[PDB]
Design a protein around this nucleic acid. Structure first.
Ligand SMILES: [Mg+2]
Ligand SMILES: [Mg+2]
Ligand SMILES: [Mg+2]
Ligand SMILES: [Mg+2]
Ligand SMILES: [Mg+2]
Ligand SMILES: [Mg+2]
Ligand SMILES: [Mg+2]
Ligand SMILES: [Mg+2]
Ligand SMILES: [Mg+2]
Ligand SMILES: [Mg+2]
Ligand SMILES: [Mg+2]
Ligand SMILES: [Mg+2]
Ligand SMILES: [Mg+2]
Ligand SMILES: [Mg+2]
Ligand SMILES: [Mg+2]
Ligand SMILES: [Mg+2]
Ligand SMILES: [Mg+2]
Ligand SMILES: [Mg+2]
Ligand SMILES: [Mg+2]
Ligand SMILES: [Mg+2]
Ligand SMILES: [Mg+2]
Ligand SMILES: [Mg+2]
Ligand SMILES: [Mg+2]
Ligand SMILES: [Mg+2]
Ligand SMILES: [Mg+2]
Ligand SMILES: [Mg+2]
Ligand SMILES: [Mg+2]
Ligand SMILES: [Mg+2]
Ligand SMILES: [Mg+2]
Ligand SMILES: [Mg+2]
Ligand SMILES: [Mg+2]
Ligand SMILES: [Mg+2]
Ligand SMILES: [Mg+2]
Ligand SMILES: [Mg+2]
Ligand SMILES: [Mg+2]
Ligand SMILES: [Mg+2]
Ligand SMILES: [Mg+2]
Ligand SMILES: [Mg+2]
Ligand SMILES: [Mg+2]
Ligand SMILES: [Mg+2]
Ligand SMILES: [Mg+2]
Ligand SMILES: [Mg+2]
Ligand SMILES: [Mg+2]
Ligand SMILES: [Mg+2]
Lengths: 61, 102, 50, 96
RNA sequence: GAGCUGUAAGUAAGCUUUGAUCCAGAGAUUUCCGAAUGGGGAAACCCAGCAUGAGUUAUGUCAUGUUAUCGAUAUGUGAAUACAUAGCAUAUCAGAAGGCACACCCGGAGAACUGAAACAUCUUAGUACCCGGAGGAAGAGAAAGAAAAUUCGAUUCCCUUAGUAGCGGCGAGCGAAACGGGAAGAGCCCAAACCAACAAGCUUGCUUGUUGGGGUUGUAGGACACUCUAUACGGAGUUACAAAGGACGACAUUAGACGAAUCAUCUGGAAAGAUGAAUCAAAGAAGGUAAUAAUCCUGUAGUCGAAAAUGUUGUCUCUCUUGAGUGGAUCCUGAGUACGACGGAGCACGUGAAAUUCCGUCGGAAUCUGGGAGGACCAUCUCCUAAGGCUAAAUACUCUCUAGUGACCGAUAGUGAACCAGUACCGUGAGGGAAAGGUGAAAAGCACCCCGGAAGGGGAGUGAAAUAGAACCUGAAACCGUGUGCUUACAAGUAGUCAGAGCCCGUUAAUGGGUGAUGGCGUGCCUUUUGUAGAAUGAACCGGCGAGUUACGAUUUGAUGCAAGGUU
RNA sequence: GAGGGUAGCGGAGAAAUUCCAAUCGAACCUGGAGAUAGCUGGUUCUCUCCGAAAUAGCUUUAGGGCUAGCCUCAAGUGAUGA
RNA sequence: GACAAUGGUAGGAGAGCGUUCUAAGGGCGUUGAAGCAUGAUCGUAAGGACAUGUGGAGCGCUUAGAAGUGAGAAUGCCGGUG
RNA sequence: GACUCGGUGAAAUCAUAGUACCUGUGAAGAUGCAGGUUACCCGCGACAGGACGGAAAGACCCCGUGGAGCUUUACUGUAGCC
């Protein structure tokens, strides 16, 4: 139950593939980071993905 | 049922075919009727029961209602029954004479 | 020739009598029948169709 | 299956390709043209309606099998050299 | 409309024409457990707070209501810590919860036996199982589409394209789409530019934010400017396109009512059968009735019917609402998006020359002289206009209700269950899971006598039948007995067969039936084997049940129709 | 002794492949499910005509299979057979 | 009329018997259907009649159609009984 | 306990059985076949040579392109760590 507080960016599932094309299940996790932003006008430490943080589009306060 | 307690009926099927008698009881859930002097059964009665005297008792057993037919009030012939509405009341009519039965 | 309500209703209850139209003719009905009674209009319609 | 002997359709090789733009023509021979009255203008529509050609495919090609016995003006998408020569020799005309 | 107090008999006491029972609509009541919610708990129990009330002199006892958690909205209060923010307290809420139809839908996560005659890529299969979310359907949907002409014009679904094009240890196998033919059809709303009002920053410049207006696109549309048109005239509507109602009417569902027409004799326990003579039919569907009934009953065809509730609809009402054209100066037209790289996934397409589409990570545009697509890629041309949303129908399914149907079963079948069956029984539990139908037309269900403690029986009686007497229609076979015609105690037997006296019978009357002194010949059956009396296998016996089927394709043969046509 | 905890891709084991509800080299139940079985067994009425093979080749093949050889049915050829 | 053929496992080919159901036609049945039982009956086989007893209400036959269509064996399943 | 009597009363097994021996024959070790030899019919108490006796579809052996547990510098992977 871990996802980007801002965008909902979350982990996905897929395959790890060997050179012989054997397949094993794996996950791609989001690059989440615990940051303090303004939530409902109050500071709060939430999980935010690096991509949601990129270019200062989220205010850390 | 089209036959009613107190009606005078003719037996049209059975050992008692041709006998006439009064309907003295009906069994709606079995479609059966009891007619005087018709369908007499001899039942073995134990004197040891609540009735001291016992033996062979003769009494009418019920007959299927489709085996008795109403007698026409005028001609006294067996007749089927229809229904009329006189001043909002259902009246049984003999289909042979057209007269009210009761 | 076409659906004839009164003929259908008058023949319906007679055992052995079947009623059909020219369009409704079929091998089973014809073959089962001993006799066919066809109106002149129906006969002409059948002749046109076949 | 051949019980483990390499099967025929693996010991033999694959050959060729399929052309994406392949064209195939509905063919009509002169013997078939012989059914139209002399002086007729035979066209793809007339061939279809008359039932000589059922499926037009990429168009109508006239081929030279049989003998043409009538003078016609034939319109088709293609003609064999022999078909065109026979149509002309019978006094008729052809056009693509 | 005359009986009734269920199965379910009995007895008892009663009810009912002053209309019972019974049938349909509406309403009342509806203990306890259970999401279970005052707290607890080993479900159907235990233990409380608060308010009001009953009772007691008072305590003890009792009644009713209320008190879970989370969420949302308000109010008050308010820490570290000043301001107020945690927090805390109170009030409101038809807010949530839980269940299930073992179906259908969408999504998360996701096997293996198996096939490949081994096996890893591949297959089984995105199947089973698990989980979440629904809805009556869901999903999809009004082109950044399909294509390549005289172009088409949302989506979905059926036919066909076609086992084609393709994919593939190019193995096993996987396998489209567009066109064409059909079912059904319906189109819309925002964001932005711009305008007006309000509030903050107070340049008190005009920036930001909120509200309302405006606007919605490829034939580029709109803003903007101008010109016409109207304040609901018209138009539209609660199925999207905004959202609540009201009046009246119609129809339908949920009980019901009427409803034609046959008598006689014979047999028989009984007639519906047979025989004879009639009758109705918009009714000859069907069931029942003492055997097989159009005319006896229940019905059928046909016609009629609703106090009340529910459903679908129509008209009024109600509500909402302007609609076009011209211009090309400026402005707007969805950004961490499109797209790229890497790693995966999805596309019929396994990374491939891989378009088209999604996810993670990192990088990252253009702005109508723009942007996307036409299967790498570029040019040209052509078609579109992404990064916002909504949307009925055609399609899927069936726990259920109503009316019906079947060259479907008929008690070892058909449901596991025709019957008090998910029971009995088995298991700690999940869970597994049976056997068992038939008196008779009517209960008339055997008064009475006799033997016996009873059970059981013999009479008598009821009944057409008791030889139908209670798991009571029929009553096969294995198996067990009693009697007996022939036969057998010096004989070596797969048990019969062929020959044959004697004795006993007498038939579907046939150059008969039963038995068998004695003679010849002769090691069961099935399976499996080179070969089985085999001391190889199987069967205690009898009965029932128990194994090449169906669908869709292919091929061949026969048949039949038509034939350079044939067929949908 | 009582009340409890650890659960099967797992527990527990002073260690024996030892125990986990009377058989544990991986409990039990239900489901995928009719797994797969080139193996063994079984496969139900009758008569009539014809009537084999147990060989070659290849085979992760050797008690399996494929094509050929030998059987059968039909149509054709027509003396081509012994 | 003649004269030729007719052992047979796997297996091929053919013609048939019998079971349930359906269609149409034509019949039977309480003056006794099916089922069961017995018999010295008939057909080349599968099998088909007839009589009598039991039984007590249903059933043949002809042509065609359709199949849950034939059991002696599976350490077969269920029941009954040795 | 067995044995006899009164009461009660199973089981495995079982193709049908009127179930001798010898020498032979034979799927090469016969109650059942040949040729001889022996033997009146029916019980009861006992013994175990045979019925290749019953019990368990041999666990040894081999076979199946069967299963499972285990090993490793077999192959291909992978949790995890760097
Ligand atoms: Mg509670
Ligand atoms: Mg395999
Ligand atoms: Mg295999
Ligand atoms: Mg939808
Ligand atoms: Mg290869
Ligand atoms: Mg265009
Ligand atoms: Mg609306
Ligand atoms: Mg009536
Ligand atoms: Mg009537
Ligand atoms: Mg009569
Ligand atoms: Mg990629
Ligand atoms: Mg491209
Ligand atoms: Mg692109
Ligand atoms: Mg291209
Ligand atoms: Mg829809
Ligand atoms: Mg039975
Ligand atoms: Mg059953
Ligand atoms: Mg059962
Ligand atoms: Mg009986
Ligand atoms: Mg003697
Ligand atoms: Mg052999
Ligand atoms: Mg051997
Ligand atoms: Mg022996
Ligand atoms: Mg064996
Ligand atoms: Mg045995
Ligand atoms: Mg048997
Ligand atoms: Mg231990
Ligand atoms: Mg060891
Ligand atoms: Mg144990
Ligand atoms: Mg499977
Ligand atoms: Mg199996
Ligand atoms: Mg021969
Ligand atoms: Mg090889
Ligand atoms: Mg022969
Ligand atoms: Mg011979
Ligand atoms: Mg054959
Ligand atoms: Mg069968
Ligand atoms: Mg003793
Ligand atoms: Mg004793
Ligand atoms: Mg034997
Ligand atoms: Mg020998
Ligand atoms: Mg001897
Ligand atoms: Mg032994
Ligand atoms: Mg063995």
């Amino acid at each position: 139950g871990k996802q980007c507080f801002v965008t909902g960016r979350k982990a996905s599932t897929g395959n790890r593939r060997s050179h012989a094309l054997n397949s094993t299940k794996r996950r791609w996790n989001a690059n989440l980071q615990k940051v303090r932003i303004l939530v409902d006008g109050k500071p709060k430490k939430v999980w935010v993905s690096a991509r949601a943080l990129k270019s200062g589009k989220v205010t850390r306060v | 049922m089209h036959i009613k307690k107190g009606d005078n009926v003719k037996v049209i099927a059975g050992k008692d075919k041709g006998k006439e008698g009064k309907v003295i009881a009906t069994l709606p859930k079995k479609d059966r009727v009891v007619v005087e002097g018709v369908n007499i059964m001899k039942k073995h009665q134990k004197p040891t029961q609540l009735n001291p005297e016992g033996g062979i008792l003769e009494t009418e057993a019920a007959i299927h209602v489709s085996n008795v037919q109403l007698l026409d009030p005028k001609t006294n012939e067996p007749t089927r029954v229809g229904y009329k509405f006189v001043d909002g009341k259902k009246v049984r009519i003999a289909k042979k004479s057209g007269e009210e039965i009761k | 020739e076409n659906e004839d309500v009164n003929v259908e209703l008058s023949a319906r209850n007679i055992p052995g009598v079947q009623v059909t139209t020219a369009q409704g003719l079929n091998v089973l009905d014809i073959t089962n029948a001993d006799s066919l009674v066809i109106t002149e209009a129906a006969a002409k319609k059948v002749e046109e169709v076949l | 299956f051949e019980g483990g002997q390499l099967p025929l359709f693996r010991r033999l090789p694959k050959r060729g390709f399929t052309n994406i733009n392949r064209k195939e023509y509905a063919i009509v021979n002169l013997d078939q043209l012989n059914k139209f009255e002399d002086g007729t203008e035979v066209t793809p529509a007339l061939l279809v309606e008359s039932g000589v050609v059922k499926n037009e495919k990429s168009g109508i090609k006239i081929l030279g099998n049989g003998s043409l016995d009538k003078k016609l003006t034939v319109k088709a998408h293609k003609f064999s050299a022999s078909a065109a020569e026979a149509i002309d020799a019978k006094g008729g005309a052809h056009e693509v």
